[PDB]
Structures are given as C-alpha cells and as structure tokens.
C-alpha cells in the first residue's frame, strides 16, 4: 500500500516563514518526507545579553512549521549530532501512538532514526521533545515547534464557505526559566548539563523569567517587522508548548479564530483575545482594513510589556476614515 | 455621509450600574457622542487602609460601561485636565486601526481630543490606556473599562430566538500589584510617578497583592449589593484587561454564556464556570429561580476569598422547595 | 409529588472508579439516595513523605462521582462524625439555590443533615465543601468531588448521533499549598487547627507546592494504572475546584471534548490539549487505537512532571503500523 504512494521531499524555512504548500490538495495522499537536525545552541535572548543553552530543532526557536493534508503519511528524518550532548526524541501531538512518537525516537548524540505517522485529524498540532525525566527541561529550553495538517479543501467558515490566505506566518512563544542569583542576576553556564540542577528549580518557582517570540525579546520588531497590505488575507499560527497565552492584534482582531486549533470545529467570529492552553497550538485569520503598525501581544500585558511576549505587524495601504478618524487632534483645552 | 447622520449625546452612569439604551435599534444608525475625563487619584483598596494612586476613566475603577448598536459611530471626546501629572490616551478594542485609537488620543496634561470610529462587529470588548512604555503600568492602575456594540436586533439564544434582559450590570475585575516592604507591609507613594521604579518590580512576579470588583474589597457587598427580583433575566457583563478570570454564580449558572463576548457566535449554555481571557470583557444571561443572597466570584477561590474578588447578588421572591430543600435540618447524630 | 416517586439507594466507589449506573434512562424520573460522611485524615502526598491533614467525603481525595439523569431527585445524607474537629457544609454546582446548598448543610462534628435538589441541567459539576471564612481552607485540603447527571437518552456527538463508553473514569487534579520553612522543607502539624495560620500564607502566594491526580504523586501509575483495549471507547471525567488544568491524553486525543462539562452544547472535535477552569468539571471521550502506555498529563509539562500532575493509561492490543511505525530504529549515523 505505502510501497505505491508518491513521495515528496520537503525543505523546511525558519520561522516566522512557513514553507511553500498548496491550501486545497491538488494530488491524493502522499508520504512527505522531512529532516531535521537537532542543535543544542547558546542562544542571547535579551538586550542585556542574558545568554541561554538553547536545544532547538533545526537551529531555531520555535522549530519550523511542517505542513501537510488530511491522510498524508508524515516521515521524519530526524538526526542527533556528535557534536551535541544530551539524549533527545520528538513527540507529535499529530500522531496516535507511542506517545506522540516520543518512545521510538530516541537519539543520543551521533544517532538518527526516521520515523512515519499518519496524520488522521485535521488541524495545527504542537510537537516538541519529551525525553523521559527530563520533559520540562527540554520544552522550555526551546525544544518545540509545531505541524499544520491541512483539510484536503483547504479552510472553511463558519457557514462551510472556503476561507483561503494570502499569506501565512508562524509565530512560537516560548516560556524561559532563567537561574538568578541572590541580587536577581541572571546565572550563565558552561555546558547545558551544569545548568539542569538549578533550571529545575528556577521551573519550579512557575514564574518565567522571560516570555518571547521567536527566540527573544524583540525578535518580530523593527527590520523583523510581519508584513501585510490593506486587502491581504492573513493566517497566523501560534503555539505555546508549556504554558496559557491569549494572543491579541492591537487594532485588529481575529475575524475567524481555531484558539485549540482544530479544523473539523467551526471557527469562532470577531475574537479581540483568544485563549490558547499550554500544549496547543491554535490559528487566526485575519483581513486588514487599515494601513499602520499593529502590536501582536499576549494579552496579559506584564508578560507583553516587561518580559518580551510582542512583536509587530508593518501594513502598507490607504487610510478609511469611515472606519476611523481623529476629529479633533490633541490640543490645549 | 456622516454629516447626514443624527447624533445623540449619552452621559454616563457610575459602575456597576449602565446608561439607558435600547437592546433592539429603533433607530437607524447614529453617532453616538460621549465625553469622559481622566482623573489620576488616592484610592483605598482593602480593610487596613492600603492606598494606591488608581488612573481613572470618569473617577470609577473599572472606567463607565459605553453601550451602542452595530454599525453606530462611537464620538469620544477625551479630556486630560491639567490637575493630572501623566499622558494618557485610549484603546478601543471595538475599533479598527491606530492601535484602537490609541496613537490618535495621546494627551497631555491639559489636552484633549475627539476621536470617531465605526463599531463594525457586534460583542462586549475592553478599552484601555496604552501610552508607549508605561502599557501595563496605567492599565493595572485601573485604567480600563468595556463597550458593549449590540446587534440592532438585540440579543438571541443558541437557535436565534430572542434574549430580553430585565437588568444589566457591569462588572469590572482589577488585579493590583501593591509593592511591599520586607516584611509584607504595603508601601505608600505621594504621587503616581513616586511609585513607578516599584510598581515596575512588584507587576513582574506576575502575582496580584489584591484581585476586586468595582475598584475595592467589599465593593460588591452589603448594601452594595447587586439586586433582582426570582423570575428576572439578568445580563452581566464582565471584564479583565490583564489577566484570566473565571466567573462563577455560587447558586447559579450562566443560563447563556459568550464567554469570549462576541454576539455573531452562538452562547455556552448551562455554564458552571466560565475563562474569560486576560483582555477580554465576557457576558452570562441568567434567570433568577430562587431567592435569597448569591456570592458572584472569581473561581480560584483564593483570589476570590482571600484577594477580594467576591461581590453579592440580594433576591427577593418566594423560595421553591422543588429545586431544592432541607429534609432532615442540622441536628446531632 | 415526591412522595409518589420511586427511591433507589447507590453505593458509591472510591475514584478513578465510578458506581454502577445506566447510561441512557431505563426508568421515569427518581429520587436517588447517596450518604457521605466526612473524613479529616493525615495523607502522605509524595515520595518523601511529606504529610498534610486532608479533609475528605468519604475517605478519598477527590470525593466520589456521583451518577444520576436530567430531572432525578439527588437526596444526601451528610454525616460529619464526632471525631473530626471542624465545621464543614456541602456546595453543589449542580444545583439551583442556597449557595448550592452550602447554607443548609452546615454540620459541626456529630451532626448530619440531609438535602434534596432538583438535577434540572444535564452535565459534569463539581461539589464542594465551603464554610463561611474558611473556603478556600476545605477546598485546597482535599475537600472536592464531582457530579455528573446525564441526559435521559444518554451522550450525543455533534450531529446528535449516540455516543455510548465502554469504560468511564474518574480523575480530580489537586493543587495543594503546603507550607514551608526558610530553607524550603514542607512543614508537619499535630492537628489540622494548627496548620491553619500557615495554610493561609501558604495560599497567597498562588503558588501550589504540589498538583496531583486522585491524591498523591504517582497515584495514577504503576499497577494503578488506568486500563483499556484498544477498540474501547473511554469517557475521562476531570475537574479542578480552585484552579485551571489543560488534561491532555499524549500518544492519543480528544475526540469528543466537553471542555466545560455542559451535555446540551455540542462537543469539540479532535482535541489535542483542552482548558478546563478552575471551578469546574469537564469530560473527553476517546476510542483507543494503539496499545501501549499513554501518560494523561496536565500539559504545563512543570506542573506535570516535577509537580506530579501526571497518570498512566495500559492499553492492550494488537499494534497498527499504518498509523505508525519506526521506519529506521535509532542508530549511529
Ligand atoms: O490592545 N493594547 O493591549
Ligand atoms: O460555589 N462556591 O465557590
Ligand atoms: O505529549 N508530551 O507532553
Ligand atoms: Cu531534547
Ligand atoms: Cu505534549
Ligand atoms: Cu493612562
Ligand atoms: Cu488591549
Ligand atoms: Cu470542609
Ligand atoms: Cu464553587
């Protein structure tokens, strides 16, 4: 059976980019083929330079997004160098069976194995590494990213009309726990292993230290910016392997939001903030309507504002009164 | 266009209560004109006389509830008299554009603006002050309040059938970061910018000294107890513009629930509990059946009993011993 | 009326087990007969050894599932005997009036009393002890359980087609806040009156000292287990009195989620991670299509793994390599 099906090789793009696909399968179900390379990596997730021994999938955090339909058969390539140094596996939230795929993808550094799935349920779904014992420490250190399995008609609406983007963006958020000394000094390690004893205190205190996007505060600004035009259709992915957010487009909103991601459900309308539990990932889309910078934020503005949970949307197009306007601008009265 | 339009002017009434309007549109649309004014001041917060400079909308901690129909133009005119020490502006997340107006309303102390936008999407949403870099500053300080933007056929049940409300309440929820000594005693400040550099520090250990209703512990409470009659159909509209509630009638349900409070989707129905999302305003129809008094709270009961975010519903009616009664009273055995 | 109608008395089961119950109603509506008496006892949580004073129904934390159908009579008897040494009450989400009954079960030791109530609503509901002042104390101690009432013609999936379990289960999550030294380690009292002035402390930090599943870490593991086949359609009840938990079954789904407990909503489809808010009870249904061990975890993978939020499925049968297989078995390359 699976000896006959057409196969594909696909090369993955670093996040907040998402690989070329098609919405709506234009072939029937295929076995897609990925590779992914782990790399335990320090990673500066600060202006101050609070530097962090990253283990990542593919070189970045989040690791990238893989997309596939309905009744693909998913096969990983995954490789563990010898230059790493810890024990690392992969489980798909996509995938039924030997917990997520976790306890046939053991890999000590210098290893590989390929694994095969099929993806039953259609949705966007989190993966991440779960190494027996050490499952927390793996996830907030970076070690997550997350698949979209597209319906093989693509995405509908609340009324079973096709709803079909323009672009698409993938944003991860990632939790971090770093060490403090007594003053509140972020603690800095040689190797990753002489950071686990005090990591597993610092998760246990279930304060992080630093919320981000893409890897560090920052990361979706400036020259970084998401960018859109007055007109475009947008789908933005987000995932949060350990923890809660509600994503919020500040002078937007999510027209037609999955919050736990899953495209059987109709979509919830005109959302201002959607919450996404810890262990999902969910999708938004959305039209603009005006020109200008958006802030993306999670909601809880403390871990927005001060611990680096926002990033930024740069929208080219002409301004709608209609929609809004300054009719009196800030004066002496 | 809107110069063809009627207007009328609304003034508004003090929290929990809400200003006159009509849940079904007699009208065609209107711009709908409204006036608040910023006041910076010392309110107390508990028991013990703990004291914070709360940033306020119209003087109420939450800001007044705004009540128009879908497709109205909302006509804010917004004042920062020159009694206050810091810039303001607002964010409306019923609007589209301008970081929901907020780059457009930046005043001064001494200023003011008037700022227009079209309510296109029917729900509760939350407005706040958003100044660039003091974001979670203002809006924890209580500087936050909800618009309410009905469908011009008013409300509607889970098959489209009509939902009449007797009464509407408007309940605000505040979580407050007081920053306290070494020994646990809230600090006390001369003026807003005194407590800034703490205010800062105490926000990102991310846990509330206090979480209330209606800007105080026991606002809700005794004679301030929120009234119905068994046999009234009650709406209350709930806000949290930082962080995650999750509302509960003790004796109660939430007959209709739009949790996330948007009225083009259906309602939960049957709610024990609902998540209402940090940034987000909610609200629960319920029909009162029994009487007597009903605790309304958050239900992680340790920010409900011992933080403060508990308030109380006073029935009157005659008791039904069908739904519930005492067969065997309290007695030795 | 009442007088007229047929009595039934049930025996209850200590949880993850549930009594004996017929899922779709054979019988007209009845008076069912439950008797709980409480229990203040010592219980040991963790590997450790450290011990707290649990205030149970019953003898076990969670307190047992209750089964009845939409339109039954819930009669209880509440004995609080002479050997314990506080107040305490019973709160029913499931029903309408006297703070769900709270007000009209107030026994001291060597009381009891018996309430009757209408289950008008159909879905999973938490219980609960609640004493004037001393709430959120009971609850955090163990004092908690859960109700479920059934619609008369049993569950029903989104199109209103039959859903009938094979096996149904019952886990309550419980946040507890032991109290600690300078150093860290948990403090022991003589009797449960001692630990109060602590217990209180301990609480405001918000933050749980341990979170676990049917009263202790690891007590859904080992020979504890919970079993299944595959084939069989399992239905996992879960509730979480004071605090929210996102259930997620790793290496299978939800098919069909309830996240909020509530049968006349129609279920979410193909969950991969679900919230449920503190204060309620919600329920996931899942066919089982792979054999192995399954962890069912809190997916904030730190309140999980180093906090002991985290139970084991068994499951026998045959392995299917069409959903998944290890095309290449970990090797050095
Ligand atoms: O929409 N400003 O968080
Ligand atoms: O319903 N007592 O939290
Ligand atoms: O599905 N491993 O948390
Ligand atoms: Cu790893
Ligand atoms: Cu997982
Ligand atoms: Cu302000
Ligand atoms: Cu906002
Ligand atoms: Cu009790
Ligand atoms: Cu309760």
Redesign the pocket.
């Given at each position: 059976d699976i000896s006959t099906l057409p196969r594909v090789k696909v090369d993955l793009v670093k996040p907040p980019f998402v690989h070329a696909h098609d919405q709506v399968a234009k072939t029937g179900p295929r076995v897609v083929e990925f590779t992914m390379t782990i790399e335990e990596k320090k990673l500066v997730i600060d202006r101050e330079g609070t530097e962090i021994h990253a283990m990542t999938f593919n070189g970045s955090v989040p690791g990238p997004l893989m997309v596939v339909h309905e009744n693909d058969y998913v096969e990983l390539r995954l490789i563990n160098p010898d230059t790493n140094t810890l024990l690392h596996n992969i489980?798909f939230?996509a995938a039924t069976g030997a917990?997520?795929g976790?306890a046939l993808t053991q890999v000590n550094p210098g290893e590989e194995t390929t694994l095969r799935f099929k993806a039953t349920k259609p949705g966007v779904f989190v993966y991440?590494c779960?190494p027996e014992g050490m499952?927390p420490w793996h996830?907030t250190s970076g070690m997550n990213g997350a698949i979209m399995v597209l319906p093989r008609d693509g995405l509908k609406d609340e009324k079973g009309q096709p709803l079909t983007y323009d672009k698409i963006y993938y944003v991860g958020e990632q939790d971090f726990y770093v060490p403090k000394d007594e003053a509140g000094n972020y603690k800095k390690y040689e190797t990753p292993g002489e950071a686990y004893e005090d990591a597993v205190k610092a998760m246990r205190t279930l304060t992080p230290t630093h919320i981000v996007f893409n890897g560090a505060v920052g990361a979706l600004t400036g020259d970084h910016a998401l960018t859109a035009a007055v007109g475009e259709r947008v789908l933005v992915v987000h995932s949060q392997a350990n923890r809660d957010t509600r994503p919020h487009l500040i002078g937007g909103h999510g027209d037609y939001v999955w919050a736990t991601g899953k495209f059987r459900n109709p979509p919830d309308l005109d959302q201002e903030t959607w919450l996404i539990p810890g262990?999902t990932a969910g999708a938004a889309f959305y039209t603009f309507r005006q020109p200008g910078v958006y802030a993306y934020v999670n909601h809880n503005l403390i871990e927005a504002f001060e611990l680096g949970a926002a990033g930024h949307f740069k929208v080219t197009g002409e301004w709608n009164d209609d929609l809004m306007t300054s009719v009196v601008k800030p004066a002496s009265m």
């Open positions: 489980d939230h917990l997520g976790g991440h779960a499952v996830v262990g």
